[PDB]
Amino acid sequence: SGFRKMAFPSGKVEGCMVQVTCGTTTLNGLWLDDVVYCPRHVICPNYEDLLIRKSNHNFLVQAGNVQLRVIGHSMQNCVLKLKVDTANPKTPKYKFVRIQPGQTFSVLACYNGSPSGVYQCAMRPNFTIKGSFLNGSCGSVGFNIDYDCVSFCYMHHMELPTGVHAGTDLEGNFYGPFVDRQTAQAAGTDTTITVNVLAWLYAAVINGDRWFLNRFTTTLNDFNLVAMKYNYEPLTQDHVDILGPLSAQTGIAVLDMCASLKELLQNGMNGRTILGSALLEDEFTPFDVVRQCSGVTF
Amino acid sequence: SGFRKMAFPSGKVEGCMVQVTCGTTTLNGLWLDDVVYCPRHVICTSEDMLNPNYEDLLIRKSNHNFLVQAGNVQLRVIGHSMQNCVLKLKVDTANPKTPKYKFVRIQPGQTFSVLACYNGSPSGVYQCAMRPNFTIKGSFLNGSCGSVGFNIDYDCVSFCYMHHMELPTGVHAGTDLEGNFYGPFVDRQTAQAAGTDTTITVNVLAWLYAAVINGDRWFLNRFTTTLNDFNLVAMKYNYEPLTQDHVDILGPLSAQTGIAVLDMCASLKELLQNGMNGRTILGSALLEDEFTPFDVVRQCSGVTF
Numbered sequence: 001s002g003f004r005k006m007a008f009p010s011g012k013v014e015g016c017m018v019q020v021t022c023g024t025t026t027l028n029g030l031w032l033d034d035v036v037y038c039p040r041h042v043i044c045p046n047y048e049d050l051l052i053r054k055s056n057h058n059f060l061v062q063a064g065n066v067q068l069r070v071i072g073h074s075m076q077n078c079v080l081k082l083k084v085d086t087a088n089p090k091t092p093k094y095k096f097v098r099i100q101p102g103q104t105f106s107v108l109a110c111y112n113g114s115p116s117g118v119y120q121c122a123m124r125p126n127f128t129i130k131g132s133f134l135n136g137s138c139g140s141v142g143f144n145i146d147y148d149c150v151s152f153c154y155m156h157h158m159e160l161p162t163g164v165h166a167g168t169d170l171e172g173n174f175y176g177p178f179v180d181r182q183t184a185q186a187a188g189t190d191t192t193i194t195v196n197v198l199a200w201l202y203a204a205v206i207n208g209d210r211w212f213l214n215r216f217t218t219t220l221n222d223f224n225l226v227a228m229k230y231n232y233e234p235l236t237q238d239h240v241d242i243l244g245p246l247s248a249q250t251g252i253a254v255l256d257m258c259a260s261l262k263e264l265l266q267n268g269m270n271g272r273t274i275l276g277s278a279l280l281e282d283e284f285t286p287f288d289v290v291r292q293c294s295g296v297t298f
Numbered sequence: 299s300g301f302r303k304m305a306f307p308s309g310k311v312e313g314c315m316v317q318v319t320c321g322t323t324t325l326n327g328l329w330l331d332d333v334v335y336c337p338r339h340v341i342c343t344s345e346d347m348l349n350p351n352y353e354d355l356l357i358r359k360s361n362h363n364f365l366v367q368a369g370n371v372q373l374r375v376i377g378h379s380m381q382n383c384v385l386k387l388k389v390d391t392a393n394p395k396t397p398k399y400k401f402v403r404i405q406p407g408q409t410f411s412v413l414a415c416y417n418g419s420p421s422g423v424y425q426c427a428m429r430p431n432f433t434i435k436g437s438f439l440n441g442s443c444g445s446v447g448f449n450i451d452y453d454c455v456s457f458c459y460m461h462h463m464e465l466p467t468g469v470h471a472g473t474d475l476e477g478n479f480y481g482p483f484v485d486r487q488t489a490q491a492a493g494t495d496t497t498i499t500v501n502v503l504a505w506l507y508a509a510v511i512n513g514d515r516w517f518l519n520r521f522t523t524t525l526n527d528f529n530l531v532a533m534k535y536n537y538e539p540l541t542q543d544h545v546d547i548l549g550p551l552s553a554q555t556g557i558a559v560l561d562m563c564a565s566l567k568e569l570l571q572n573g574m575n576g577r578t579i580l581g582s583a584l585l586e587d588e589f590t591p592f593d594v595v596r597q598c599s600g601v602t603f
């Protein structure tokens with residue numbers, strides 16, 4: 001029993017965190033094999049012009065108490081790749097993956113190449129993440145673990161004026177219409193991740209919270225007409241299919257749970273909570289619910 | 299900016315998790331140096347749990363009855379002893395991944411990270427607090443026994459909790475790493491129930507100071523309170539009494555934001571009376587009590603917005 005915002009064990013990622021210094025700027029890098037990946041803004045813009053003026057010895061890379069020697073450098077999109085003389089003996093099995101809005105991941109927040117905390121979050125529909133980051137956190141990474149393989153999906157680059165965060169995949173492509181520079185940028189209007197709220201409602205039913213269930217069912221079309229009015233993302237047939245297993249475990253059809261969600265949007269919770277929350281939670285995917293209510297290990 | 303329920307990086311603890319098997323029971327153990335620590339109920343059957351005599355069950359066991367698996371390697375048990383509700387298994391190999399560590403017993407209100415494990419394999423990490431009723435609101439399934447709670451302030455891991463059981467309300471009970479239970483619980487399947495829980499007042503105040511640091515003041519008012527008047531009101535909402543120790547502990551957050559502890563207590567009194575009126579505080583529509591004053595100082599900026 002119980003339901004917590006659970007992150008993946010961070011050990012495999014901790015063994016890859018390093019400190020990268022270029023002039024006056026210090027941030028975090030990810031050391032995999034003989035390459036250190038970090039945000040290109042460490043050299044700060046005309047990034048090619050700024051980079052051509054730097055030599056290998058201008059980049060100071062520190063792994064624990066050891067100084068790594070930079071023997072090459074190149075840029076890939078908004079990520080700087082520093083070739084080092086030493087391969088990371090702690091390099092786990094890994095892949096670089098680009099995630100979609102709604103998908104969740106764990107963040108290992110780091111400062112000066114030293115991990116300070118781990119938390120779980122989701123890529124919002126507006127491509128920002130509601131993280132917890134201070135100055136020096138740039139280069140901190142987001143990831144998932146599937147079996148023994150770490151899938152790196154996010155690298156932190158910046159904080160927007162509303163306090164939310166923006167970054168790139170590990171190939172340097174930003175999530176969202178953001179650019180790595182000081183200019184007027186703002187998060188777009190966000191929406192609620194509908195398939196995730198439904199997954200969390202199924203988790204509540206698995207945990208014994210059933211007060212919100214009703215005898216009614218709805219159609220996908222009627223549900224989406226209602227959901228669009230509360231700034232909820234449209235629910236697709238793919239989302240309905242993805243919720244199939246949770247629907248079979250609890251005996252509540254997806255459009256049956258949509259009728260429950262419809263009533264919660266129109267009438268509120270009326271002083272009640274669901275899994276200890278007075279808000280409808282959208283940062284647990286259907287897969288996160290299945291994994292936490294099954295005990296999958298790494 | 300931002301405020302998340304943040305856990306400590308779990309790597310130092312992951313390298314200590316092992317699987318302990320005794321007959322048909324399999325659970326988790328913590329391997330530090332040449333000793334594996336695990337709940338003593340690993341020696342019990344389900345029938346035994348009603349009224350187990352651990353001393354009688356243990357005397358019938360030899361070292362080779364305990365199977366300890368660390369990754370893909372079988373460790374050899376060369377000794378065993380019981381200390382309160384934990385079993386200590388001496389093994390023939392010291393853990394090369396043993397971090398710098400201490401065993402610490404925490405008080406209600408204190409927070410810690412939990413590395414939930416099954417079959418000696420870590421599955422997830424989450425942050426939680428020792429409730430005033432000595433239970434923890436964890437997320438644990440069958441096989442999670444022996445999973446541990448810890449803090450890692452600096453490079454040293456302070457182990458404070460080992461998971462033993464789930465109570466009828468779905469909350470969890472366990473021991474410190476010396477085998478002493480938190481709360482009036484026994485590692486026996488008898489009529490046991492969590493006492494009525496209360497809200498950790500000093501933690502809610504800390505979280506209100508975190509909201510001020512991150513730039514939000516809508517909940518403040520022009521009033522103050524005496525400590526006694528605050529406690530008379532707080533106890534009506536099932537909030538723990540606020541002591542002078544708690545007031546002293548909130549001193550640094552009070553100096554950083556410029557808001558006296560008793561003025562923040564006045565704001566809390568008003569929030570309890572009025573609710574939030576459609577508003578949120580740090581993305582929550584409830585008053586959060588699982589962040590200590592120390593956690594707020596660790597996570598939040600040193601400069602108020």
Ligand SMILES: O=C(Nc1cncc2ccccc12)[C@@H]1CN(S(=O)(=O)NC2CC2)Cc2ccc(Cl)cc21
Pocket residue numbers: 041133134135136137138157158159160161165179180181182299
């Ligand atoms: O955003 C960035 N860093 C951070 C990242 N995360 C959490 C921070 C918290 C507190 C201060 C910085 C933080 C950096 C530096 N700054 S800044 O001048 O500090 N303005 C930020 C407060 C809004 C602009 C900037 C511009 C472009 C790029 Cl790619 C990076 C960045």
Ligand SMILES: O=C(Nc1cncc2ccccc12)[C@@H]1CN(S(=O)(=O)NC2CC2)Cc2ccc(Cl)cc21
Pocket residue numbers: 001339347438439440441442443462463464465466470484485486487
């Ligand atoms: O509680 C225990 N295990 C668990 C521990 N944590 C989370 C669990 C979730 C789901 C199932 C087990 C879980 C064990 C086994 N059980 S039991 O028969 O499974 N009853 C509990 C569910 C209410 C009695 C018992 C009694 C005393 C002691 Cl010391 C240990 C234990």
Ligand SMILES: [Cl-]
Pocket residue numbers: 403404405408
């Ligand atoms: Cl304590």
